Structure formats: structure tokens, C-alpha cells
Design a protein around this ligand. Structure first.
Ligand SMILES: Cc1cn([C@H]2C[C@H](OP(=O)(O)O)[C@@H](COP(=O)(O)O)O2)c(=O)[nH]c1=O
Ligand SMILES: [Ca+2]
Length: 129
């Protein structure tokens, strides 16, 4: 895969970010993850962690997978990096999201994320406690 530049417009919530990609505003849904809704347990915690990761970053990057790049709602589908650290992976790694929505063709980082979730469990970290 390959990374592309982008800039933050707005950190919406756990699983979505609005970015300027190719000079155009676009909302991205993070691939391979499901964050607890704002009103569920760990929701506000999961949300802050995500927001701050993209807001504190000096450089945001977009990385599409080998399949569809947009979902049915018109959201871009990608792995997002903050100063070279993958946001999708970091969220799962700290027990603030679960690997989910693994679709044929967009699963390049599936095993890396599942290892992060296994590691987060070994520690009953956040959502695993
Ligand atoms: C992450 C992801 C979500 N989706 C769709 C499936 C779900 O459809 P439904 O709206 O019918 O449930 C929806 C959930 O995204 P959210 O978890 O943001 O709500 O987004 C994809 O199609 N591909 C993806 O890679
Ligand atoms: Ca969600």
C-alpha cells in the first residue's frame, strides 16, 4: 500500500475523521475498526483518544487498501496515520476499539490489528476490563 498526504479538517468521533485529501474535504471511516458509541461504556474515552491522536499530529497520512475506497455513505475507507503511527492500530492496541468490518479486499492490516487486540486483551485493557 502507499501513504498520501492530507490535513485534518475535523476529528469527528471514534471511527470518523474529516480531512482535506487532494485539496477536497472528505470524511473517512477508519478501516477494520468499531469504536463504542459515545453513549456506551468507554465511548467518551475512546473518542478523546482518537481525536487527540489526529489533532496532536504534525502530519496526517491517508492509506487506501486494495479494494473499495468509499463506502455506501460516500465515506472514504482508509488506514489513517498520525506522525507515522497508524490510528486504526493504536485504537485497538489500547483497548478502545475492536477489530471489525473485515471485508474481502480491504484486509491488508487485519492480522496486525488482530495482534494488537490480542495484546490489549492479554491486559484486560480498557474495554477488556
Ligand atoms: C468500516 C466499514 C463500514 N462499512 C459500512 C457497514 C455498516 O453499514 P450499516 O450503516 O448498514 O450498518 C456501516 C457502519 O459504519 P459505522 O460503524 O461508522 O456506523 O458502514 C462498510 O461498508 N465498509 C467498511 O469498511
Ligand atoms: Ca462505529
Amino acid at each position: 500500500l502507499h501513504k498520501e498526504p492530507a490535513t485534518l479538517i475535523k476529528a469527528i468521533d471514534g471511527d470518523t475523521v474529516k480531512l482535506m485529501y487532494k485539496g477536497q474535504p472528505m470524511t473517512f471511516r477508519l478501516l477494520l475498526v468499531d469504536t463504542p458509541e459515545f453513549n456506551e461504556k468507554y465511548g467518551p474515552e475512546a473518542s478523546a483518544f482518537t481525536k487527540k491522536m489526529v489533532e496532536n499530529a504534525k502530519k496526517i497520512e491517508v492509506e487506501f487498501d486494495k479494494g473499495q475506497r468509499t463506502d455506501k455513505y460516500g465515506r472514504g475507507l482508509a488506514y489513517i496515520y498520525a506522525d507515522g503511527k497508524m490510528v486504526n492500530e493504536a485504537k485497538v492496541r489500547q483497548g478502545l476499539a475492536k477489530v471489525a468490518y473485515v471485508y474481502k479486499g480491504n484486509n491488508t492490516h487485519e492480522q496486525l490489528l488482530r495482534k494488537a487486540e490480542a495484546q490489549a486483551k492479554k491486559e484486560k485493557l480498557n474495554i477488556w476490563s
